[PDB]
């Protein structure tokens with residue numbers, strides 16, 4: 001095939017801003033840059049859709065706060081991307097159990113200078129009994145907070161920047177916004193700048209092997225339809241997540257950093273109906289955290305509802321789709337009934353649904369706190385890695401912006417000298 | 418119960434026909450059926466896309482003959498699929514290399530007796546020279562005729578049985594049809610009737626290995642979101658082509674039949690125009706066969722033109738597509754000008770366009786006693802495919818493997 005000077009692999013937010021920071025630069029004046037990505041679309045873990053053509057839903061990333069995500073807030077304005085207020089940030093539908101939870105929290109919280117590295121299911125079970133420490137906690141909606149892998153210092157953070165449970169830790173100041181056309185509008189924007197700057201895209205292709213040959217690298221990719229493709233570049237950035245690099249011969253994670261990483265599956269499922277039936281309940285633009293397997297239920301206006309799930313519960317939900325769409329849907333009807341506390345047939349059926357499951361949906365720095373380089377180099381061949389996961393904002397979109405802007409710097413200095 | 422009675426892996430026309438056979442025996446009145454398929458929609462190599470609204474185009478199988486595909490035709494009827502006449506039978510512009518082989522090829526035809534087990538290229542390299550043979554073979558437009566894997570016995574078969582060059586063998590009377598809506602229309606009908614009888618589809622899952630575990634079998638499949646998954650079933654049919662087969666823990670093809678198998682890539686590219694410009698050259702519903710890369714060029718009423726190639730020239734066009742929409746679009750215009758004997762400025766730029774590379778477009782046969790559906794010696798699995806019939810590379814090959822394989826199975830539920 002062809003060849004290039006720079007070769008970014010991965011074309012989600014970290015990959016595509018990576019490239020645009022390498023083109024804003026004159027130190028790449030008239031240099032050839034190629035982007036490979038696996039999917040037929042650009043976006044990475046960001047995906048937007050129209051179901052029924054009625055309203056624009058988001059199968060992935062959906063929220064940001066300017067208070068907590070400055071570079072992202074700026075990247076929106078930078079690309080004339082119109083935001084809107086994100087409704088799901090207060091709870092009025094609880095039973096008694098989710099109440100009397102902010103009180104248990106604002107009190108046992110500074111008692112964590114003696115119980116901060118421990119996982120979170122016994123920092124709740126050492127300061128009151130277990131038979132009440134699995135109720136205050138699966139009342140907060142994310143089953144991510146029951147896994148041993150990650151702690152009470154990292155969990156007590158995580159409760160404060162998720163719009164639906166932040167009122168619980170002195171953080172209801174922040175506003176949260178959503179893209180008014182969807183975050184694809186932010187992607188189609190960065191994509192156009194990079195094309196106009198003369199880069200060439202190659203979507204459909206997956207990297208398999210890398211070998212370092214003199215001044216540069218020999219990539220072996222494989223097309224979506226089998227086409228075996230070979231390509232050589234002097235300079236290389238793999239802006240893919242950490243799970244993604246485990247599968248390649250790069251010595252991840254050992255040759256690059258002194259941290260390890262996990263990841264949690266996620267699951268979103270969307271439904272729409274003929275008539276906005278949940279309105280009769282004063283439930284539009286509000287959110288319920290129930291302890292049946294739906295976990296969190298959202299109604300955006302009179303338009304649709306969805307439900308968000310994580311970790312194992314996410315696997316559970318991905319199990320009942322392997323079983324059969326119809327089996328998946330009537331059981332949603334079932335759980336929908338015990339949440340709202342009505343009978344099963346007061347619940348209509350959906351004209352059309354749509355659902356998505358993420359196998360490595362959020363990847364995190366597991367050696368939770370460290371130097372936080374924000375980008376990684378090979379101790380040998382000088383390949384730059386680039387993910388949300390290498391920053392203090394593991395699992396958010398601003399981590400992609402930061403990892404990228406850092407990454408592109410290490411390569412500019414690695415070219416110009 | 419994450420488990421079932423009968424499992425069919427492969428929702429090609431083979432696999433789905435098996436499902437349709439099986440669900441009409443009364444010996445299956447009360448047995449559960451699972452169909453697995455890698456893709457997110459059934460068909461396999463039948464793939465129809467409504468291009469720009471103002472076109473219905475066939476990226477895979479496109480055409481059939483009532484003379485060689487009667488089981489297909491009866492199926493097309495059995496499901497009220499309206500089919501149209503398929504115009505690409507004559508050649509208006511037969512350069513007299515095409516005409517030279519007309520009456521050079523059909524009279525060493527009894528000389529093909531006591532020969533014909535020999536590369537086709539060295540066959541025609543016996544009447545006239547090498548460079549007279551390659552001129553005759555080039556103008557037939559099927560680069561697969563130059564393979565050594567191919568041989569002059571199959572040669573007179575393949576050239577006889579394609580609608581654009583049948584006029585050169587003696588099967589010049591077969592007639593050829595396409596579908597009003599598309600063969601997708603036909604498979605949606607089988608799938609509808611298979612679903613309605615009670616089969617359960619799990620689409621988007623692909624098989625990785627099979628354990629022969631006791632009564633039946635355990636399968637490992639992997640979805641395209643990455644989710645892993647196990648399935649136990651008692652009766653398993655692999656309705657997938659042989660290339661696929663040779664990548665599992667089943668030892669193919671030695672443990673099945675001894676025969677070796679090969680395949681061919683294929684390419685098709687389509688284009689769309691503001692004004693149908695090829696009508697002023699009286700070119701609608703014609704096909705030009707050419708000695709350049711495009712190879713075969715079709716003009717479809719006033720709707721679209723496309724071109725079609727295989728073997729080396731499919732690999733050449735997949736390799737070009739890989740180097741940018743810009744060059745592929747440009748070489749295409751370069752070679753269309755040579756085809757019509759004009760300058761490239763008379764050829765407008767297209768509005769839309771689409772293309773498909775099939776890595777293993779047609780799979781073929783190459784013991785000469787082979788049934789229409791294979792079986793494992795050791796684990797009692799049955800395989801179902803166009804490739805194990807007298808019709809390898811055709812859809813009717815699929816139907817005659819399904820009816821063979823599906824019956825090979827009631828033979829074993831009457832255990």
Ligand SMILES: Cc1cc2nc3c(=O)[nH]c(=O)nc-3n(C[C@H](O)[C@H](O)[C@H](O)COP(=O)(O)OP(=O)(O)OC[C@H]3O[C@@H](n4cnc5c(N)ncnc54)[C@H](O)[C@@H]3O)c2cc1C
Nearest residue numbers: 010012013014038044045060061062063206207361396397
């Ligand atoms: C359900 C869900 C909700 C989320 N909500 C939010 C939110 O509200 N706010 C927020 O800030 N973040 C959110 N996120 C996180 C956000 O999506 C990611 O952190 C961010 O988009 C990651 O950007 P990235 O470009 O580095 O990686 P990715 O988005 O993973 O992009 C990686 C790209 O590299 C590609 N790639 C991988 N491997 C290979 C290979 N071998 N060859 C070729 N190509 C390859 C991938 O296909 C992908 O295109 C959410 C995530 C999920 C799953």
Ligand SMILES: Cc1cc2nc3c(=O)[nH]c(=O)nc-3n(C[C@H](O)[C@H](O)[C@H](O)COP(=O)(O)OP(=O)(O)OC[C@H]3O[C@@H](n4cnc5c(N)ncnc54)[C@H](O)[C@@H]3O)c2cc1C
Nearest residue numbers: 427429430431455461462477478479480624778803811812
């Ligand atoms: C470009 C092209 C043009 C053609 N034109 C014509 C024509 O005009 N007339 C004609 O008669 N024939 C034509 N054919 C051939 C015809 O389409 C095929 O011979 C026939 O469709 C084969 O069907 P099948 O059911 O045997 O398997 P396939 O159609 O090959 O389908 C097999 C199915 O199994 C699935 N599958 C495979 N492997 C695995 C695995 N490991 N795990 C899980 N799932 C799996 C595949 O996704 C596929 O859906 C054409 C073929 C091509 C490529």
Ligand SMILES: Cc1cccc2c(C[C@H](N)C(=O)O)c[nH]c12
Nearest residue numbers: 142143144145162264310362395
């Ligand atoms: C347990 C856990 C750890 C990191 C991330 C998540 C998300 C999704 C992401 N935090 C978001 O909603 O933006 C849900 N659960 C998580």
Ligand SMILES: Cc1cccc2c(C[C@H](N)C(=O)O)c[nH]c12
Nearest residue numbers: 480561575579681727779809810
């Ligand atoms: C080399 C070879 C062997 C058998 C079959 C085919 C087809 C299929 C046929 N041309 C069609 O599209 O109808 C194309 N090439 C073939």
Ligand SMILES: [Mg+2]
Nearest residue numbers: 010011012015
């Ligand atoms: Mg990326």
Ligand SMILES: [Mg+2]
Nearest residue numbers: 427429432656
């Ligand atoms: Mg099949």
